[PDB]
Design a binder for this molecule. Structure first.
Ligand SMILES: Cc1cc(C)cc(Nc2nccc(-c3cc(C(=O)N[C@H]4CCCC[C@H]4N)n(C)n3)n2)c1
Length: 268
């Protein structure tokens, strides 16, 4: 889906920056209406071929996903840099939002992380692994509606395997022991990451494993230690984080079980 650069207007003041380049706000003219978009634009004109490949692969993943809790891609634009154009989630990354809005109620945090678990249950059912599931990569449409983005490390699993095996530069603080030790990424690896994301959410966007190097995090986890309970965090939510942080992959829940535990309404 290649878009017409002429139908896109970009604002100069970026929404965000990352090691890869910038995210800009824009407006894309559809058949009748304009749609507000967030646009990922690669740094230094997309001359870095690995960056460009990563974008195209990110676009290829997003194009295949259709779920209310996953950001929708409109398409890619090759103009002055390469650009991935996405429907805009106007409240921005969850971590920043919670840093700035410290009176969001527990029930509301549970609601948001339940939405993330519904999107991840969909990804699991679709046999994709996200591999970068962090609060910074959850976008708020409204204070009561979260979506997942940032599919740059995501992989479609082979039909005969339950994991992706890497031959990286990685968000180690969100990774399960099997990712670190064996380079194996399953949906259950994403569940571990989700436990970190829950910790972040109930800590109003604090960084996990503050002050620690990745080697120190690995050592801490191998010793059976885990981050402590955020001040004020509901006990049941901390208990669910510890279940997501089950060392043994076979006994760690999948997203179908996690999603059930985050439903705040009666069900079977
Ligand atoms: C107010 C505000 C700020 C920002 C930054 C984004 C938005 N909305 C928005 N809506 C849909 C999608 C995205 C988005 C951001 C990134 C990304 O690449 N983000 C990276 C750089 C920015 C901060 C976090 C990081 N993962 N992707 C791959 N999709 N964003 C709104």
């Amino acid at each position: 889906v290649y878009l017409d650069r002429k139908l896109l207007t970009l604002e100069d003041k970026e929404l965000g920056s990352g090691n890869f380049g910038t995210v800009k706000k824009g407006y894309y003219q559809m058949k009748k209406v304009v749609k507000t978009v967030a646009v990922k634009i690669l740094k230094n004109e997309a001359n870095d071929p690995a960056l460009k490949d990563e974008l195209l692969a990110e676009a290829n993943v997003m194009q295949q996903l259709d779920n209310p809790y996953i950001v929708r891609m409109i398409g890619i634009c090759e103009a002055e840099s390469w650009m991935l154009v996405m429907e805009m989630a106007e409240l921005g990354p969850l971590n920043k939002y919670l840093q700035q809005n410290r009176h969001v109620k527990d029930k509301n945090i549970i609601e948001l992380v339940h939405q993330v678990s519904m999107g991840m249950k969909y990804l699991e059912e679709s046999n994709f692994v996200h591999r970068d599931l962090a609060a910074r990569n959850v976008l708020l449409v409204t204070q009561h509606y979260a979506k997942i983005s940032d599919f740059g490390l995501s992989k479609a699993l082979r039909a005969d395997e339950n994991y992706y095996k890497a031959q990286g530069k990685w968000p180690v603080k969100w990774y399960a022991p099997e990712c670190i030790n064996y380079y194996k990424f399953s949906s259950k690896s994403d569940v571990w990451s989700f436990g970190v994301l829950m910790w972040e959410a109930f800590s109003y966007g604090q960084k996990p494993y503050r002050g620690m190097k990745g080697s120190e995090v690995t050592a801490m986890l191998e010793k059976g230690e885990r981050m402590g309970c955020p001040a004020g965090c509901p006990r049941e939510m901390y208990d669910l984080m510890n279940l997501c942080w089950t060392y043994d992959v076979e006994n760690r829940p999948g997203f179908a079980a996690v999603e059930l535990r985050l439903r705040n309404y009666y069900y079977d």
